[PDB]
Amino acid sequence: NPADNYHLARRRTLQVVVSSLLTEAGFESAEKASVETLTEMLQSYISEIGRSAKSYCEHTARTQPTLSDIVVTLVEMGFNVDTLPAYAKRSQRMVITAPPVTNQPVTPKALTAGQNRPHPPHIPSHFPEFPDPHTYIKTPTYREPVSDYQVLREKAASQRRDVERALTRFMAKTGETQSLFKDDVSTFPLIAARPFTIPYLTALLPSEL
């Protein structure tokens, strides 16, 4: 979680500092509540020279503090500043490393490059570009229509030929049949002649009228 790592990268650096300052001419294996006590007094001490040396310089109409604003800030906290050049030149002096950076890759994204659409004149050019079509563009689409007279004539012709062939083979198979050749029922079956009782009636009369 990088949210609490904004605070814990610098407070757990102050925990290594107190653990390095309690080892210099001193302890090993301290109590746990005694370390979070002392690193709370350390954070509250840096934050108090921050607020008071800024207040002493801004009282003198300035914005960034000089040396004369901190040697009056440390006097008002009771520090005895003169003992500090001797403390800085220890042989036990140690350096605690700064915390690591979350964005170690920095630039690891190939990205997704998509451009479509422009800007209406109430949006200047420095605003971000309008995104791609899939985000908000919808058009219905239909099936490919075959309006060709050649293939429509071919379709109607072949369907009529196939249905009349199927009808005549079904009627020749389920009735009396003839065959121009010998024992020929599978290939070219003929519906047998039927002397009717309605002669001229089935010849001369129209059926579609």
């Binding site: 196939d162 249905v163 199927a166």
Partner: protein, 41 residues
């Protein structure tokens, strides 16, 4: 849209062959339905 008389007659014969007058006409009607190429429409 309306069936032509050819396929209207084919529809009539095929449906009335599967109502139960005899079994042989039913078997030939089902072998027609299963094995014809143009029965769409």
């Amino acid at each position: 849209h309306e069936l032509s008389v050819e396929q209207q007659l084919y529809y009539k014969e095929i449906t009335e062959a599967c109502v139960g007058s005899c079994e042989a006409k039913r078997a030939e009607a089902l072998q027609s339905i299963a094995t014809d190429p143009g029965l769409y429409q």
